[PDB]
Amino acid sequence: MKGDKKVIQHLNKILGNELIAINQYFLHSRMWNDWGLKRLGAHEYHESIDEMKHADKLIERILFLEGLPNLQDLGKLLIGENTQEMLQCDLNLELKATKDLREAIVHCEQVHDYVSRDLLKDILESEEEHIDYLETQLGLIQKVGLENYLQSHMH
Amino acid sequence: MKGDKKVIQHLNKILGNELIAINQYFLHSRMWNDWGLKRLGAHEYHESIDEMKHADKLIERILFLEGLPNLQDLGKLLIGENTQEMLQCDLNLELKATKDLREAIVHCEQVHDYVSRDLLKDILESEEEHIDYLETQLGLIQKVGLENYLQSHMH
Amino acid sequence: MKGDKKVIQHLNKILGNELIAINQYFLHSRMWNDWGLKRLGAHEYHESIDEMKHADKLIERILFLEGLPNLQDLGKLLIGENTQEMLQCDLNLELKATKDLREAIVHCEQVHDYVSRDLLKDILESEEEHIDYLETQLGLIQKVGLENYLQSHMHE
Amino acid sequence: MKGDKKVIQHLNKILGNELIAINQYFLHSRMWNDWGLKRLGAHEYHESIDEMKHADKLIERILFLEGLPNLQDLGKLLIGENTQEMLQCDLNLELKATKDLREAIVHCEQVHDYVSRDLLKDILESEEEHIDYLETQLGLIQKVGLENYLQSHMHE
Amino acid sequence: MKGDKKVIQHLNKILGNELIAINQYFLHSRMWNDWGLKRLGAHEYHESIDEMKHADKLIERILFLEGLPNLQDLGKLLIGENTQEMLQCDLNLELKATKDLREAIVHCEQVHDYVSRDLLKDILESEEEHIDYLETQLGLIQKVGLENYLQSHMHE
Amino acid sequence: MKGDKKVIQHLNKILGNELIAINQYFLHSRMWNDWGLKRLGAHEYHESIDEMKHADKLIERILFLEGLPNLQDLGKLLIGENTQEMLQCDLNLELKATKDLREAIVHCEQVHDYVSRDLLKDILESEEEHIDYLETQLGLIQKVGLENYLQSHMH
Amino acid sequence: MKGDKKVIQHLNKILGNELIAINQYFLHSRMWNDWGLKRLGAHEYHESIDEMKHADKLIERILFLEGLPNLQDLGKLLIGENTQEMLQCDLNLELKATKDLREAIVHCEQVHDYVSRDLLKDILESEEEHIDYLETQLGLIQKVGLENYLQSHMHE
Ligand code: HEM
Ligand code: HEM
Ligand code: HEM
Ligand SMILES: COc1cc(O)ccc1CCCNc1cccc2c1C(=O)NC2=O
Ligand SMILES: COc1cc(O)ccc1CCCNc1cccc2c1C(=O)NC2=O
Ligand SMILES: COc1cc(O)ccc1CCCNc1cccc2c1C(=O)NC2=O
Ligand SMILES: COc1cc(O)ccc1CCCNc1cccc2c1C(=O)NC2=O
Ligand SMILES: COc1cc(O)ccc1CCCNc1cccc2c1C(=O)NC2=O
Ligand SMILES: COc1cc(O)ccc1CCCNc1cccc2c1C(=O)NC2=O
Ligand SMILES: COc1cc(O)ccc1CCCNc1cccc2c1C(=O)NC2=O
Ligand SMILES: [Fe+2]
Numbered sequence A, B, F: 001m002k003g004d005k006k007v008i009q010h011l012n013k014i015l016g017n018e019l020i021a022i023n024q025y026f027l028h029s030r031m032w033n034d035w036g037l038k039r040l041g042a043h044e045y046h047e048s049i050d051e052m053k054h055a056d057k058l059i060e061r062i063l064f065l066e067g068l069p070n071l072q073d074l075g076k077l078l079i080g081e082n083t084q085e086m087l088q089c090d091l092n093l094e095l096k097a098t099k100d101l102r103e104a105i106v107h108c109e110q111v112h113d114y115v116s117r118d119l120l121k122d123i124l125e126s127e128e129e130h131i132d133y134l135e136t137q138l139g140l141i142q143k144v145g146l147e148n149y150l151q152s153h154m155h
Numbered sequence C, D, E, G: 001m002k003g004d005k006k007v008i009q010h011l012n013k014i015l016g017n018e019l020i021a022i023n024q025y026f027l028h029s030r031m032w033n034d035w036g037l038k039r040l041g042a043h044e045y046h047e048s049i050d051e052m053k054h055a056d057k058l059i060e061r062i063l064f065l066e067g068l069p070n071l072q073d074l075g076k077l078l079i080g081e082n083t084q085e086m087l088q089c090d091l092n093l094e095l096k097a098t099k100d101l102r103e104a105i106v107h108c109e110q111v112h113d114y115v116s117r118d119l120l121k122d123i124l125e126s127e128e129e130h131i132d133y134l135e136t137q138l139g140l141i142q143k144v145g146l147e148n149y150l151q152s153h154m155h156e
């Protein structure tokens, strides 16, 4: 079914953001595991899987709309050097992603691509859940102190 | 995550309506139970619980958006003194609630808070199902007569 | 069964305290959840549910006694801005509640409404258990430190 | 254990009321069953059984206190001639019974027989629940009409 | 169905005997339990329950025959002051009861109320089984001695 | 929670009575078992356990009320030299215990410590049941004779 | 079986130590529970129970040996005012207890009461396990710090 060219460009932009996130979150996960912070590692792993599932849905939608899904271009990964930076890097990436999601929804609404809008809204709900997790972790580091926060994520 | 100030004000207005509904429905339920109309009492209790769940979701959303959920200001309860009046009081409250939900959704759309809009759309679906229930009960009173209607809600 | 007018007034005062506590505890619960302190959030949630069940019993008793349960007036919520203050706000509310419960029981006894007395005694038992909980949490914060206390309430 | 003479006298007065209630409710039950109002007949049978259980407990307490339980004297049954009157008869009996229970509890408290008071308070709670049932049934007769009310109690 | 007036009068006389027995056996039961003779107390409780079941059936039959079941008049209880006397009291009551049952059956047969006769015969069989139990217990007291007999009824 | 000083003194006096009863019942139990009267031994053992459970509740209440539970002072044990005396010693102890319970309940009521009253009433109900048991055993000894009574408590 | 008089005196001395320990550990348990240190409270409760079981075996042995078990004399409880002091009070008691156990075993061996020796040796094994627990707890406070040690004992 022939989709709106600009819808497909927006979907490819969102996909590009998900592809960055997949890799950034997977590397952060394996860094935490290597450091022995296995609870952070497992949770970041699951965040990476979630972004993989969103990427799948975006790829499927673009193909249905007779576009070419862009898996070739990979933007800049934001990799932290300690737990605090890694969480902040994830959050900065998520805030860019939700800005881009909002602009894409605006355009889907204007051209009546209501199914693409519904998909983007579901993804946005997932990303806002991830923002909530990240903001809460950074707040916990303040409330319990960094040593305790790391301790609580060892096992 | 920093929410739109007026979105938060709208969410607090909806929360205010839910808080009224919780108490109005809880009292109507216990009145109906006291009167021996336990099928009305039990159905109205479930309506109160549903409003409790909507309030919970609004409180959670407001806190995520870095606002203050107002659980202090309670508006006017519409308490009836007989079965038909209590149903009409619930209906009047629900029609006010859905008007407010539509205005809040408009503003959520205008500032691109699509997750808040989706939460409110879900609440609106629940309130319209309650409106359907209430209009149907009021119609049943007309069709089967008040005495039969009450008889059918004793057990 | 028409009850004593002042008994019903006492029951509505107790109910009014329970209504404040429902909302105060529910907001504190959701604040703690928002902050990542989910074990505190869950325990405070269950305190709010407990007060909802007390409010229900009071409403039922007032209706049986042919009075009007007051769900319209809501007194001042005591909302804290950090964990220690939130617990202390809950404790201050509970100490007001148990004083009111004692005065109500005295009056029930005087007018021989022994069933209302028994209901209030059961509610008083629950509120003293909550006071025990709150005083103990406040003591634990002093013994293990706030950072450790909060750490121990991160995961449910 | 040697109980207070006036406590035992109060306990025997409460027992006397329960013995009336047992017989009154059992006959009402079987009248309703004979008339085809089997839901009323079954509910009233369970009220009779409950009064039998209360009488058992009173008998047991009187004997522990070294009194003689009075099962010989039977006061006046209040038997109605139609469903409304039968429910009202039960209610009139319960209102007398709860008055007597309150006076007995007063005296138990004065002479420090706290266990007898506790037993009487538990009975008082059951009797107030019965009064609630009866008042509600009589209100329903007015709200749904006598014909509908009886229709709703034909089948169990 | 309109029953024979004198049949109903006989049925009310049998019902009166059962109402005595219910109360007599229930009190004896609770006396034995208070004294620590719990096997006697339990057996006598089950005798009381059986008389309650017979009274139910008589009440139901009287109402079917369009009579008024008499639950207001209660004859003289025979309460013993020790185990032997209590058993003898039950026996004296049962021998009066079976005499009355026979006279009632005679009249049912004369006026062709065969269903009432059948109900009374079933009750008569239960009462003769009770007489057998009682006579046997009294014989055992003589054969094993009072002290042994009571010893054998301490534990259930 | 700061308790009434005289309530706490009453609670410590009741606790004192329970501590005597724990030890008196436990010794009587083990004496009966040593004599081969194991049904008496077992029943008296369960009486001792019950008093232990009451003592626990009293200790917990005293600490909640910010008092010091007195586990140091132990009053006079009433130990019998035969079964009849042992039962009578238990009964003498229980009759003192229930008198003290009533005086403590009076004071709880006067100072509106309704929860302490409720605890004491529950303990009083248990002690009255123990009195019933003991009075009944002593009556059975007279009805069946000592040799049969003891025989019935061998196995 | 007529036991050695001095064995019985030693058994009564060990019993006296156990009676102190029962009460001291029970009170420490309930203090920790009140303070919200429930893992410590539960563990100390089980220590108190273990001492109850030892006391029972000693009482039973003394009676078999035809002695009088002394449950009247209760020595000085060592009650701490904070966690470190309570642990050290428990340890001081246990060290006195095991010294007395060794002296009692020596005497049992000398008079050939090998079964009493075996009983005391089993108790000594239990008390040495308690000493290991206590010394380890005090060492952990030094290694992880008091605040962390207490944190780790908040939740069962
Ligand atoms: C801020 C206002 C309130 C909120 C946010 C709230 C929230 C809730 C929630 C989330 C539940 C659990 C529902 C479920 O998933 O099963 C609940 C249950 C309940 N609520 Fe409320 N509630 C509020 C006020 C009240 C009031 C005023 C009453 C009664 C006067 C009440 C009575 C109850 C009862 C009886 C239950 C069922 C508890 C049980 O037995 O499990 N609630 N409430
Ligand atoms: C002193 C008077 C009475 C006493 C103490 C008494 C006591 C009791 C008790 C304790 C029960 C058992 C209830 C339970 O735990 O489930 C019972 C059952 C019953 N009683 Fe009575 N009752 C009395 C009078 C009567 C009378 C006058 C009748 C009939 C007219 C009656 C009919 C019954 C019946 C039908 C049952 C149910 C038996 C079953 O389990 O099927 N009772 N009674
Ligand atoms: C002579 C002194 C005591 C002796 C010989 C003794 C003996 C015993 C024994 C044998 C048990 C059962 C243990 C098992 O489960 O196998 C027990 C349980 C118990 N004891 Fe003691 N005890 C004594 C004093 C105390 C005291 C002073 C208290 C409280 C202050 C106490 C509180 C308890 C409790 C709470 C239980 C558990 C009961 C249950 O719920 O099963 N004991 N005791
Ligand atoms: C998937 O598109 C199709 C749909 C069709 O119906 C028929 C053919 C095609 C493939 C056309 C060549 N595609 C390339 C080539 C290089 C890199 C990329 C892609 C791409 O599609 N995404 C990349 O990253
Ligand atoms: C959710 O509040 C917070 C979030 C935070 O992250 C930090 C602090 C606060 C507390 C600030 C005082 N809040 C009050 C005070 C009084 C009444 C109400 C409230 C409210 O929020 N709703 C009411 O009904
Ligand atoms: C005796 O009735 C009245 C006397 C008056 O002077 C004025 C109005 C009424 C009936 C008003 C119906 N009941 C209401 C109404 C609103 C709120 C509540 C209730 C209630 O019962 N609990 C509430 O919170
Ligand atoms: C509880 O009776 C006892 C307890 C004892 O420990 C020793 C003896 C007795 C029986 C004394 C004669 N009792 C009668 C006699 C006739 C009617 C009644 C009663 C009665 O007790 N209630 C009645 O309705
Ligand atoms: C079976 O009664 C009825 C059947 C009907 O179909 C209609 C009406 C009646 C009630 C007439 C008044 N009955 C009383 C009154 C007082 C005492 C007794 C009774 C009684 O019946 N037995 C008593 O001990
Ligand atoms: C529960 O006591 C406390 C509560 C606190 O919050 C803080 C400290 C304490 C310990 C104070 C010393 N207590 C002793 C000393 C010796 C004997 C006894 C006791 C006792 O309490 N009962 C006895 O039998
Ligand atoms: C176990 O005693 C016996 C064994 C028998 O075979 C025969 C009689 C007796 C009782 C002799 C008086 N006993 C008392 C008296 C007071 C305190 C204590 C005791 C005691 O034994 N331990 C105490 O703490
Ligand atoms: Fe109808």
Ligand SMILES: [Fe+2]
Pocket (backbone or CB within 6 Å): A148, A151, C148, C151, G148, G151
């Ligand atoms: Fe830590």
